[PDB]
Amino acid sequence: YQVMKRASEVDLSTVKYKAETMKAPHLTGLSFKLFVNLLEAPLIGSLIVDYLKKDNGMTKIFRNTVIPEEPMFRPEFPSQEPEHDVVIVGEDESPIDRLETALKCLPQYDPSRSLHADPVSSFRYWKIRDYAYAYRSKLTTPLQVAKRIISIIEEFGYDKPPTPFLIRFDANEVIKQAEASTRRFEQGNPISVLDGIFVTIKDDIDCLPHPTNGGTTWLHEDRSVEKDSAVVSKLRSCGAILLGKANMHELGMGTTGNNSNYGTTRNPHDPKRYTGGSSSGSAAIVAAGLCSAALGTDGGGSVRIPSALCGITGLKTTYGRTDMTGSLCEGGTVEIIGPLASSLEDAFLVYAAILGSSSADRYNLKPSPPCFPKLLSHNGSNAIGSLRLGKYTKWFNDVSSSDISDKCEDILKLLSNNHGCKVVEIVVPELEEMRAAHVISIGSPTLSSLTPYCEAGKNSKLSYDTRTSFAIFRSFSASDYIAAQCLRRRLMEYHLNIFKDVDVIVTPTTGMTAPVIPPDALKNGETNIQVTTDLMRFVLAANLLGFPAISVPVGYDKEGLPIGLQIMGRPWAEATVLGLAAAVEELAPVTKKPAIFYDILN
Amino acid sequence: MGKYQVMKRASEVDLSTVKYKAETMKAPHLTGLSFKLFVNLLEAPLIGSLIVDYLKKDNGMTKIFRNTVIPEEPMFRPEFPSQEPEHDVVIVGEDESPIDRLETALKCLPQYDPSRSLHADPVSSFRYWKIRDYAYAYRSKLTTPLQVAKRIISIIEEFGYDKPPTPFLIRFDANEVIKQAEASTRRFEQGNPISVLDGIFVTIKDDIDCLPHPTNGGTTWLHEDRSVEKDSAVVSKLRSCGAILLGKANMHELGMGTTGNNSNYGTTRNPHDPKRYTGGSSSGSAAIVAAGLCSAALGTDGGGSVRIPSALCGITGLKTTYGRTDMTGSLCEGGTVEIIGPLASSLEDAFLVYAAILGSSSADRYNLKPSPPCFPKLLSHNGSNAIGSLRLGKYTKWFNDVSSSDISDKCEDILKLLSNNHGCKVVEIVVPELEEMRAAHVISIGSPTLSSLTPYCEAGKNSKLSYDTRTSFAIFRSFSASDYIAAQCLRRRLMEYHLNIFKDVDVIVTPTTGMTAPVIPPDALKNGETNIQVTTDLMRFVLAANLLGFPAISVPVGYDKEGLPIGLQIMGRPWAEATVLGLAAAVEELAPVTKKPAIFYDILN
Ligand SMILES: *[P@](=O)(CCCCCCCC/C=C\C/C=C\C/C=C\CC)OC
Numbered sequence A: 001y002q003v004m005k006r007a008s009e010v011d012l013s014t015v016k017y018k019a020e021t022m023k024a025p026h027l028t029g030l031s032f033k034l035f036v037n038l039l040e041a042p043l044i045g046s047l048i049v050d051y052l053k054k055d056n057g058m059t060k061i062f063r064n065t066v067i068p069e070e071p072m073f074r075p076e077f078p079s080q081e082p083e084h085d086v087v088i089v090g091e092d093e094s095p096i097d098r099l100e101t102a103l104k105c106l107p108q109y110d111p112s113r114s115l116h117a118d119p120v121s122s123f124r125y126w127k128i129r130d131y132a133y134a135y136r137s138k139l140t141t142p143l144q145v146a147k148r149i150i151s152i153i154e155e156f157g158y159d160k161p162p163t164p165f166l167i168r169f170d171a172n173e174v175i176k177q178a179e180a181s182t183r184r185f186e187q188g189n190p191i192s193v194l195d196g197i198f199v200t201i202k203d204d205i206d207c208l209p210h211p212t213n214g215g216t217t218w219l220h221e222d223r224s225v226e227k228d229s230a231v232v233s234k235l236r237s238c239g240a241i242l243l244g245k246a247n248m249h250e251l252g253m254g255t256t257g258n259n260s261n262y263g264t265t266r267n268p269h270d271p272k273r274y275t276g277g278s279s280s281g282s283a284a285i286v287a288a289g290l291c292s293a294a295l296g297t298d299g300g301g302s303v304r305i306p307s308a309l310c311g312i313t314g315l316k317t318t319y320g321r322t323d324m325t326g327s328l329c330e331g332g333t334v335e336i337i338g339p340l341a342s343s344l345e346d347a348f349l350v351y352a353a354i355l356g357s358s359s360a361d362r363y364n365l366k367p368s369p370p371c372f373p374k375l376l377s378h379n380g381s382n383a384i385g386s387l388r389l390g391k392y393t394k395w396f397n398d399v400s401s402s403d404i405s406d407k408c409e410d411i412l413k414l415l416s417n418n419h420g421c422k423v424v425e426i427v428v429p430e431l432e433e434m435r436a437a438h439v440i441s442i443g444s445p446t447l448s449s450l451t452p453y454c455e456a457g458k459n460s461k462l463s464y465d466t467r468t469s470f471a472i473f474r475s476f477s478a479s480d481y482i483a484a485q486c487l488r489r490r491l492m493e494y495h496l497n498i499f500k501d502v503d504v505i506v507t508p509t510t511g512m513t514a515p516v517i518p519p520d521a522l523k524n525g526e527t528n529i530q531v532t533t534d535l536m537r538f539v540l541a542a543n544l545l546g547f548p549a550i551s552v553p554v555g556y557d558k559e560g561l562p563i564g565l566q567i568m569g570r571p572w573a574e575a576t577v578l579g580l581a582a583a584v585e586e587l588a589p590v591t592k593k594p595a596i597f598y599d600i601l602n
Numbered sequence B: 001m002g003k004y005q006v007m008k009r010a011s012e013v014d015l016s017t018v019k020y021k022a023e024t025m026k027a028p029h030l031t032g033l034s035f036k037l038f039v040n041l042l043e044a045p046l047i048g049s050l051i052v053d054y055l056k057k058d059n060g061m062t063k064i065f066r067n068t069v070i071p072e073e074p075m076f077r078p079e080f081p082s083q084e085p086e087h088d089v090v091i092v093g094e095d096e097s098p099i100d101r102l103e104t105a106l107k108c109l110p111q112y113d114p115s116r117s118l119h120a121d122p123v124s125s126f127r128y129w130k131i132r133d134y135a136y137a138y139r140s141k142l143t144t145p146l147q148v149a150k151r152i153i154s155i156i157e158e159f160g161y162d163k164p165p166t167p168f169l170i171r172f173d174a175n176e177v178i179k180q181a182e183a184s185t186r187r188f189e190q191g192n193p194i195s196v197l198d199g200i201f202v203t204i205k206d207d208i209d210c211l212p213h214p215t216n217g218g219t220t221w222l223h224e225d226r227s228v229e230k231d232s233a234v235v236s237k238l239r240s241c242g243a244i245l246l247g248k249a250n251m252h253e254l255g256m257g258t259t260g261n262n263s264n265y266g267t268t269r270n271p272h273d274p275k276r277y278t279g280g281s282s283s284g285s286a287a288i289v290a291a292g293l294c295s296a297a298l299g300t301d302g303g304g305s306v307r308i309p310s311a312l313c314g315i316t317g318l319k320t321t322y323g324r325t326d327m328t329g330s331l332c333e334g335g336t337v338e339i340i341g342p343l344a345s346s347l348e349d350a351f352l353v354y355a356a357i358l359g360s361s362s363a364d365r366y367n368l369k370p371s372p373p374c375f376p377k378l379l380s381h382n383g384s385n386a387i388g389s390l391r392l393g394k395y396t397k398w399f400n401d402v403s404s405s406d407i408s409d410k411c412e413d414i415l416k417l418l419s420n421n422h423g424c425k426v427v428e429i430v431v432p433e434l435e436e437m438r439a440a441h442v443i444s445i446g447s448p449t450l451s452s453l454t455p456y457c458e459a460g461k462n463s464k465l466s467y468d469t470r471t472s473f474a475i476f477r478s479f480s481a482s483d484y485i486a487a488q489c490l491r492r493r494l495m496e497y498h499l500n501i502f503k504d505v506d507v508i509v510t511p512t513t514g515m516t517a518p519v520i521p522p523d524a525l526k527n528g529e530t531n532i533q534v535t536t537d538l539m540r541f542v543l544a545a546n547l548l549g550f551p552a553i554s555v556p557v558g559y560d561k562e563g564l565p566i567g568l569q570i571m572g573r574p575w576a577e578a579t580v581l582g583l584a585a586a587v588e589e590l591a592p593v594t595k596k597p598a599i600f601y602d603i604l605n
């Protein structure tokens, strides 16, 4: 009849790894169009959605299970222990000041990796300090860099269909910012290290003068941008150059990057393969090397998923660490603003510039003061060696590719021998509940935000991929949301008891490499909940609970596709995750040059 | 303007622009057989949804939840900032035992007068027996708790107050009451009473766990699936003070009503007028106290279920701050509007029961971080005390929107009496977005209740509920997940409005209900009734304290034409129960309860 639960009294040796993959049809082209109309149809529409929910065990969890826990609507963290060997910085200091403290945590820059080098060395991306050193040594100017970037955008059509990196780009505004930045390097007063650095903002974050469409073709008609967002205003005050708005999966409803209105962004490592969603353009423009870093959102993996598939670094901050004022996902309970950079050094600098909780979340979440990891230290490995790396073996190997489970396993052995890390076995109970509780916790705010727009007639202007998801989200009742928040408390009490034994939780970022794009889906989208969910089977933990996580390249598989490793640490412990990730890049640096790559500084 | 989509703004509205939007609730009044078919239509597949969506479209709820962009981030649970410490109050630790707080609260009370219990002039007025009157008679050996228990049990059996059609209690065991009274009587003979509440009779609502009686919540099957095994937090504290748990009170089924109509156990009748309703959902708790059987009772208040019956029956009900009292061991735990509040015959009794049951849960202590409990110095501690230096907020349009000219003036008489006898300032205020508060409340209370019992109803137990509950559940299943998000966005708007009001005033005074005791239609006694118009009209003042968490209280302030009780509500700042209790104490001084109800039982003789 009904199933009974009790959270804080389960035996961890009793929890069995339940691996239920998602079951949904794979429709493209015309059959997708008719399927969307059947879902939006009156009577038959509700039957198809209730069938999909009961087939995937969601009705059994929300409606046929009594949960004794009280709802935890927003992530609630206890007072954490202070992390060891870190530099505390003020949370309300100017981003120009935090960039200087961060410059002290980085190892000393050596000029032998930019100007003069042996022409028989390996491949590496350009660090932010490589541009900063060249701007200050009068080797190049941000104006000449902007011209070379704009030259590539227009030569290859990366600002127009079918394969764009940016969906809102203005060359005249890029030159306007690079001129004022160049004249500050000539007068001898650069603002900070980020002065002259090109960054790309995702289309769901406000950034003047471009409007915020969120991947749609009509959001600027009902939601006009007034001022810069909290993260862009901080970046702009450091002298950064906003390149433009990035292509994304429509409204973040997808983990592939399919956009049937502007085009599907292609993976720089293989143009016939997806980039990963939803920050598709942000990840591709950084992997291609056009810009140094990019800002994106992550309410279900939209920062780490496209970072692992494209071979870059994506930082997912703690819930509330970065101010979300001025974006489409503000007010949610899983989303944050995270950077996507080519190397760890670049992502750390951007994190130092954009961090800072909002005035509201400061009084509700009570965050700890920000910390910068001392990435360089001649003393013994004080913190790196004394870390316990939690690992769920049955969850670690459940991947659709034997290459990514062993290439991550090689890094763990490399971490234990070259530093002394203890790999502790853990168990993550109720993994199917965390997926069901997450999908409703991400969709309900998104559907509510656009509900007055859809009922006014703008629902037909959405892609078939979004309308299919919104049809499922309308099935979630208010009682279903309450039960999901009660599940969020259970998953919280489990992970808190895990973080008392281990410091981080290492897992592969995705369960597969860069997937192939079916040629029929390029005409109007596709519904593939099986593959969309399969990409989130490792990142839903940090979103639903708010823990900070990161994605780092750890090598490549058989066909040369990037492999991503995830490191999720304690709340507010970005410095712990950043420092550990810095050692992972030291053991397995990015070496393969992607197919679509552009060298700027030359 | 309302053309395509509506657009809002919160912390930038002009309070001089806000105009009062009055009563709007429209719904059918169906009883008997027409009620049964209407329920079958609502539970019918296709036509059931169209009727609900019509009622949501007709009452303007769909335009609020679906056709209005709200520029606020959702506030799921009541968030309060740091409050200014209330003046002239006694601070007591939140960790002390309930017996220790009782001795501290006894110091705050004025000196007891034995000339009001044993020896008095036989030509005086009417007055309820206070808790200290029982404690005096027990300790002076004028009577024992065993003799008092035999007197109460004699009345319950003689008038069938534990049986249909008009019961006060739905779970009553006479053998258990004597068992608790025997142990209480010995402690007075041995000379070691536990506290002042030792020997006092209190009644627990049926949705609160209280051994050995099971918890049904007004239903007839909830004990089959939810069995109680230990006392609740509020009951275990009262039992540690020597209180006598009289039994589980009658209530509206699962708190889904504000009238007290229960077609499974009967409808409890108002002691002032048996042909009239008691007010819900704590119908039995308020009737057994107003009748003089027990000194106090425990009930819930998620939408006025403590204040509404207290005003209709002529007693005092204390709605504490959200999180102030532990709700562990009840059917409403984990909510966002409900609390456990006492219902007593006098302010002195409610203040003592509040001191014994208070105490935030270990989870709510960390998330809400409440200030330490404070007890008001009820005696004349200063002379021209802080009572006069209080600003009373009043919304004149909202104050007078009542379906009876008597309750609007009898409450206005108390305000003039407070200003002349103490010096209170009556500041005019405005409460913006009153219709949004009603919409955001009903979904915030209905969704967790429906989610609590969803596995039981889908297991076939949905047919065993009354038609009144199934009517509400048919509406509650219509609230989508996106509708709940927008409702919490409205909770933040009403919060920023009321917080800016508390920057100017200390409390907000309004009438408790917009009408006196309504008459029970003789057809509703068959299988309940659906009357959302009256069910909502009784909550038009008490929803602000539930959706936002502010403490409120309902105090009798006189009677109307036909001799029915009138209630006045005082809602204060968060965690400021002492401010609300102190001002309410002065109100009972200026207008005490003088009319004896029809059904009344003197216990001490
Ligand atoms: P990111 O953080 C991308 C994260 C993915 C969010 C979108 C997922 C929605 C899935 C679509 C439909 C629902 C899937 C399963 C529901 C249950 C049964 C239906 C098959 O973006 C910001």
Ligand SMILES: *[P@](=O)(CCCCCCCC/C=C\C/C=C\C/C=C\CC)OC
Pocket: B026, B027, B055, B056, B059, B061, B254, B255, B256, B257, B258, B280, B281, B300, B301, B302, B303, B304, B305, B306, B442, B445, B471, B472, B475, B532, B535
């Ligand atoms: P208390 O704190 C009593 C509070 C009232 C709870 C039950 C009220 C439910 C109302 C019934 C139906 C819904 C009313 C309006 C919805 C909108 C349109 C429907 C016509 O109990 C603990």
